[PDB]
From TrEMBL, chain A:
The chain holds residues 420 to 938 of 1102 of the full protein. It comes from the Bacteria. It comes from Chlorobaculum tepidum (strain ATCC 49652 / DSM 12025 / NBRC 103806 / TLS). The keyword Transmembrane helix does not apply. Coiled coil: none annotated. Residues 27-185 form the Roc domain. This is non-specific serine/threonine protein kinase. GO terms for molecular function: ATP binding; GTP binding; identical protein binding; protein serine/threonine kinase activity. Keywords: ATP-binding, GTP-binding, Kinase, Leucine-rich repeat, Nucleotide-binding, Repeat, Serine/threonine-protein kinase, Transferase.
Length: 485, 328
């Protein structure tokens, strides 16, 4: 059982489906479908590499025999490849977790001129895809023969590369790595499916791609035509295909009229919103959608536009404030305290996802001050906490989130924990994220002690935190009871 | 009133600059003779790739610059401005004043050759590397010899060498013979870490790089002068950090660290803004760094235990400091 294991009744339907197919004497087929995410700085040759193999958003889908290295390979004759290029903006992440973590191959593209961003992109792949296989391609080698990277070290730190490093100029080897990635013990070929599921998938794909989306009646016809009539498994099948990002299906919205969608039409929809000059400031005037989507192949009617907004909401890319004015936090301006003993609490990421602050802003929308919110932070006020005032700011250069709070001491602590929680809840959506929590030293805002350090000093039964470079001692408990207790 | 280029060039240049203006008076501002020489040198160096000492001296004497010291400060001036290349350190009158472009694409061709893929320049390949791999871009035996000398002056490579030159920036990222007893462990963390630090340290320490134990991001130094002490200097680009691990007797260890540390500092000084903090790892726990000035603070305050909360353990501050620097 794949991670369709979400839904007790889902688990049941899957077994049921491969039981009737076992009883009718049919062989359990495989999905034979894969997502290749091209990852890299703008042009480190994403288009050029792709040109080499086949002979801003987009997909190109190519079957294995057409990929440069695999022409005569039988093992995956029937296999499909979906080359995805998100900006570096992983739009599917919030609502389609598995789209990124399952069924995926990450293909990192580096060159001499882009080499220093390698560490960033390596962690980017780690946190978005999970245990997904990764393939490192070094490009433009013809211009700099000496160009290489600390492979051993990189492979030790990132065991999902499994030594799939390639030096390329003027490629058939990258196809062996692709083959290797697809056949991963835990990727697609590990899950037997009933022929039914594969049949309706194919019919569903042809349809959605051709006629932007399908209505409830249409998909139900397709399902009966392949002899899937139980609504309980039809839901789980669509559930499954959605989880895999083959076809989109939003059970939360559940509109009969736009029931199952071509992933491409939806993605090109939100990108046009995201990158429109009429949302350049972080404000979407609903009126503008017609212009944005249609005049500024892929056309969007009035109904479609409303639905697309809802998808953005589901993707956690925006929120309604109630004027027909949505906020898109990631497009906000980059630019827009010290009452009592202001509680400060700092969170150090090894990689700070650029979706964190946008997603926290949504979780917290109700408490934002006087629209005192910007690309890198927000001001939060809760009457529920005597009128405490908190500032959550994000510094990209340090991969750090700072929380400063004003108010009575019981208020501060309890407020922190609710902001702290919401942050931790977002963090959990990313795989091996690595956050360390700090506390500035009293009288020395820039000197930080690790919260883990203090707790450890308490378990030891020590009350002194000794700063050698300052030559001052501090009460472990006193600064600790400012945070929890 | 002299320009920075002349100042940097030393006292004699500043004097020679002044002689130049005082002399003209009787007949950045400069004398009509310096521009005349410049104009003629530029003119000469677009029909010739270079000029010899005689040719240059002739051009100079025609503009009235007979003083050999004045000649040398003006060529040094023109050099510092990349208008005309001139290498005071080098001693070959045959190739005396050079065309910048001819040098530029010469050094480019060397460093970016497929024959220097892995940091080894096998000089006998030079004729091939520079010519075959615009007839202005020809390089004869003597001309390729000189190019190496320029490259050494630019600290891009050194001589191993039985016709073998090392180009550190081009060395493999990993090697087959990397090696690994209370070894001294000392690390420097940078705000930014120039790529040229390791290559430059290698040129400075080259005599002690003993078994080709050198890769792009590190080197193993072996000191005959420190009872066979072995030092392992590696740079890690992620943390922007340099780590020094030394193996030897206690005195030998920290003696040899002062030498390595000192060289890197003298490298660090060529960069206008470098922030470098010094750390020491906890015995048994390499991942866990404690700052050097922190351990120093602890000793002045007079306790001998460093207390780690993350891992419920205490350590001797005296032992840790003693691993890097004697008491005093």
């Amino acid at each position: 059982p794949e991670i369709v294991k979400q839904g007790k009744e889902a688990v049941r339907q899957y077994f049921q489906s491969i039981e009737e197919a076992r009883s009718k004497g049919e062989a359990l087929v495989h999905l034979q479908e894969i997502k290749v995410h091209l990852i890299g700085d703008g042009m480190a040759g994403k288009t050029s590499l792709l040109k080499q193999l086949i002979g801003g958003l987009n997909v190109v889908t190519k079957q294995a025999p057409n990929i440069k290295g695999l022409e005569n390979d039988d093992e995956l004759k029937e296999c499909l490849f979906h080359f995805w290029d998100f900006g570096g903006q992983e739009i599917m992440h919030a609502s389609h977790q598995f789209f990124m973590t399952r069924s995926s191959v990450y293909m990192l593209l580096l060159d001499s001129r882009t080499d220093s961003n390698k560490h960033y992109w390596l962690r980017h792949i780690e946190k978005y895809g999970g245990k997904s296989p990764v393939i490192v391609v070094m490009n433009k080698i013809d211009e700099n023969p000496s160009y290489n990277i600390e492979q051993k070290k990189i492979n030790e730190r990132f065991p999902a590369i499994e030594n799939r490093f390639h030096r390329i100029s003027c490629v058939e080897s990258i196809a062996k790595s692709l083959k290797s990635a697809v056949l991963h013990p835990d990727s697609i070929y590990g899950t037997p499916l009933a022929p039914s599921w594969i049949k309706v998938k194919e019919k569903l794909v042809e349809a959605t791609t051709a006629q932007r989306y399908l209505n409830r009646t249409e998909v139900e016809k397709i399902c009966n035509d392949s002899g899937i009539t139980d609504p309980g498994e039809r839901k789980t099948l669509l559930g499954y295909l959605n989880n895999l990002g083959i076809v989109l299906y939003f059970e939360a919205l559940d509109l009969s009229e736009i029931y199952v969608l071509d992933p491409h039409w939806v993605t090109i929809g939100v990108y046009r919103i995201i990158n429109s000059s009429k949302t350049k400031n972080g404000h979407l005037n609903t009126s503008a959608l017609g212009y944005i989507l249609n005049e500024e192949k892929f056309t969007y009617t009035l109904l479609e536009q409303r639905y697309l907004l809802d998808i953005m909401k589901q993707f956690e890319l925006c929120y309604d404030e109630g004027k027909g004015l949505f906020i898109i936090p990631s497009n906000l301006p980059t630019q827009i305290i010290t009452e009592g003993e202001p509680l400060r609490f700092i969170m150090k990421y090894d990689y700070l996802p650029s979706t964190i602050i946008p997603r926290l802003m949504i979780a917290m929308q109700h408490q934002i001050l006087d629209r005192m919110q910007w690309r890198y932070g927000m001001v939060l006020k809760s009457q529920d906490h005597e009128g405490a005032l908190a500032k959550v700011v994000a510094e990209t250069k340090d991969s750090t989130i700072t929380i400063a709070i004003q108010g009575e001491p019981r208020c501060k602590r309890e407020y922190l924990s609710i902001i702290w929680y919401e942050i931790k809840k977002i963090n959990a959506n990313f795989t091996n994220l690595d956050v360390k929590e700090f506390i500035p030293l009293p009288g020395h805002p820039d000197e930080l002690v690790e919260y883990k350090e203090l707790l450890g000093l308490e378990k030891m039964g020590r009350d002194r935190y000794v700063s050698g470079k300052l030559e001052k001692v501090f009460s472990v408990s006193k600064m600790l009871d400012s945070v929890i207790s």
